[PDB]
Structures are given as C-alpha cells and as structure tokens.
Structure 1
C-alpha cells in the first residue's frame, strides 16, 4: 500500500481518486506486480531469479575457454650487424622458417 499511494503521488495525476484491485497469479509464487497510472513495477521470483541466472549465464558465455588468448605483440627484429656478418644470406630463410613454425607449430 505505501508504495501504491507513493507511486500515485509520483504520477502526474493525484487529484483523481484511487481504486485498487488485487488479483491472483498461479505462475507467480513470490513477489508482486503493481500497476498504477499506467506505470508497472514487477518484483517477482520468476523475474528476479531469472535475472540473476541470466547474469551468471552471460558471464560464463562471455569467455572462450576453448579458444587461445592473444599472445603479446612482437616488435621489429632489428637484427645485429655481428649476426648479419656471420650469416649474410641465411637469416631470411631462418625468419621464414620462424614464421612457418609460428603459424603451424
């Protein structure tokens, strides 16, 4: 009742008299549904429990455990002049094999 007339005051109309009608739901076993001045508030078990279950379901769905996470990014190689002087023509083949292994292996 307190919430009923408080919502009736919060409504744009309050000078009009208020007539209250209470009904029974077989689907709802806990909580209430209140409508005043074409404004409805639903605080029921069917809604609250499903809302809390929806949060858990969404949180579980939100992550892909079957997938692999993004490894940190690799900056540029910037190979050293010493290694280049030791292996002039071979670092290209080794880098290609490194890409091949990073993709496949």
Structure 2
C-alpha cells in the first residue's frame, strides 16, 4: 500500500524519512506503547506524511503496530528493486565495523559474479552480529561468504581414582598331566587371582 501510494507521487524517500522519525520517536515512548497506542494523540507522528500516517492508523485499528519494523523492511526492499540498488549486508563483530575494506572488495566480487545485478548499483549496509568475535561476513542476494571466527575450567579427572588391575585367570594346557592335577592347578589359579586383587 505504501509503495503504491508513493509511486503515484513518484517520491519514495519521504516514506523512508517517516520510518526514521518513527524509529527515533519509539526510542522514547514507554514500554509496550504499541498496545495503548493512539497515533492521533502522539505528537511525534503528527509530522509524518499522509501515506505513512494513514498506514499507522490502519495498523492501530487492527492492533498490528508491532509490525512497523517488518513493514518498513518490505518497503525498503521494493524501493531498492525499483531503483535498481543491490544491498550487501556486512555482518561484523560489535565494534569491529571500523575496517570494512575487505568487505567492500568481497561485495564487489560477489556483485560481479551475479549476472542479474549487472545494472544494479552496489550499496553496503553494516550489521552488528554478536556471534562473531573476529572477521566478517558478506551477504548479497542470498550469496553468503563467511570469513569470521567466534569463541573457541572444569575438573578433568580424579587423581584419587585408580583403575583396578583387571585380573586374568591362568590357563593350563589340556594334557593328561593337567587332568591329574586339575584340582591342584585350579587352586593355584584361584590363589593367583586373589593375589592380583589384593596386591600381594
């Protein structure tokens, strides 16, 4: 609806500015303002364009003001497609956005590979990801390149614990001499096992 309304006038940046004002205003509104929201009474929204203000009232009537962010993203995607702009998301660690020289090179290389985006203009948008501590990632039209790394004190073993000495019963060759001494040989094996278990 916003895209169709803006297309008639031919100006799309007005809606983007309205979203920026909404985001700035929301930062000061009380928690859970979207459920007691009255856009008419809110002075911050009084400066918005007619299409944006109408849509906000439209959401408030249906109680879907919680989708303000998603609606904005869908709109920005339409504007970029209409204006032939390809946005590359550069995911970087918090505070690691200072160096993006390699990210731009990777984004350009991905842009060259994509034939569909030959005429599209390359844009870079930085995003902060707490899952990566070092490096960066680049996403463009679904093509994702990862050049990042993340994070890499328990009790390992019981020193007191000792594996018991697994005894083995001695086996005698099956000759006649064994049969005559079967009882005697068995006693020796039992004594041997008892010695092994106790130690001596």
Q: Which has the larger radius of gyration?
A: 2
- TM-score of the aligned structures, taking structure 1 as reference length: 0.43
Q: Give the structure with the higher percent helix.
A: 2
- TM-score of the aligned structures, taking structure 2 as reference length: 0.28
